[PDB]
Design a protein around this nucleic acid. Structure first.
Ligand code: CA
Ligand code: NA
Length: 276
DNA sequence: TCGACGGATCC
DNA sequence: GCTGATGCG
DNA sequence: GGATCCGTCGATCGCATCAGC
């Protein structure tokens, strides 16, 4: 079935207006996404922080259009060291964060340009591009090593300040989070080991799944559709991109959106509203 | 993701 | 410069 | 014993890069 995201809810459950709009988006090749007019959409959506994943672009090749974003003038990039046109993430913010770091404090996992951390007054924001488990699960062993290291690291962070984690976490948590759960139980993104890892990340830090806190019963809500087999037009997709929130930010949560119509990638954008 | 193929399983 | 592969999703 | 379910397989799209010439 198809799915219509409901209108933006911009008031907290205590009547306070939203003061921060975070937009996350796996662009799957920054340079191609630019040509497919993805920055035009970002300009209209006008967020305070933009998080992009799977950038496939070294910083010395960063397109010139990124210099035409006045409301997003503070930009931070993490490329891999060895591989080219592979992974890479970006974090752009209207105001300058207090401190910016890269990776998760573990040498084995900081080589691929997947994590950026920005600290603000009231919270720390982590944007993430979690390693896919791979065709034939030939990275699933590494991904469990990732999940373990990443979970610990985030718990350390969330114990200091309220944490927002956004990005492509490369797993559909429950059956409701993808269109064909029955047939994907041994494919990357829906194995038992990645599903449990996600549940463990939720229960251990702890963190809530913003979208599921607000619409626990809503199915057919996805952020990725394969380019093949005309999946996007049949809404045969996966929910892979998340805003994960500290429980102490839930009183501040106004809405968590899935921007289904915005093209440019095999992922769509998600955006978070918070009253801070 | 989807189709085509053989090989169970079902009342 | 073209064409069609590869690695990775 | 006609139908339906089952688990493999292969190919499919796109980006960025490379091989070859
Ligand atoms: Ca020749
Ligand atoms: Na290559």
């Amino acid at each position: 079935a198809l799915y219509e995201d409901p209108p933006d809810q911009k008031t907290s459950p205590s009547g306070k207006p939203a003061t921060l709009k975070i937009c996350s988006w796996n662009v799957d090749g920054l340079r191609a996404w630019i040509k497919k007019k993805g920055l035009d959409w970002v300009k209209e959506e006008a967020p305070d922080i933009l998080c992009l994943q799977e950038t496939k672009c070294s910083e010395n090749k960063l397109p010139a259009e990124l210099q035409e974003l006045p409301g997003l003038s503070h930009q931070y990039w993490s490329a891999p060291s060895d591989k080219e046109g592979y992974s890479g993430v970006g974090l752009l913010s209207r105001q300058a964060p207090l401190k910016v770091s890269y990776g998760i404090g573990d040498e084995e996992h900081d080589q691929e340009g997947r994590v950026i951390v920005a600290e603000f007054d009231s919270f720390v924001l982590v944007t993430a591009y979690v390693p896919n488990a791979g065709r034939g699960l030939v990275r699933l062993e590494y991904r469990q090593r990732w999940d373990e290291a990443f979970r610990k690291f985030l718990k350390g962070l969330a114990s200091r300040k309220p944490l927002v984690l956004c990005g492509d976490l490369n797993v559909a948590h429950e059956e409701i989070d993808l269109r064909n759960p029955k047939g994907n139980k041994k494919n990357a993104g829906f194995t038992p080991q990645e599903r449990q890892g996600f549940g463990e990340l939720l229960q251990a830090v702890p963190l809530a799944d913003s979208f599921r806190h607000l619409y626990p019963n809503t199915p057919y809500a996805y952020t990725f559709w394969t380019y093949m087999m005309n999946a996007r037009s049949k809404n045969v997709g996966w929910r892979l991109d998340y805003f994960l929130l500290s429980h102490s930010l839930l009183p501040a949560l106004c809405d968590s959106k899935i921007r289904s119509k915005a093209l440019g990638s095999d992922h769509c954008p998600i955006t978070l509203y918070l009253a801070l």
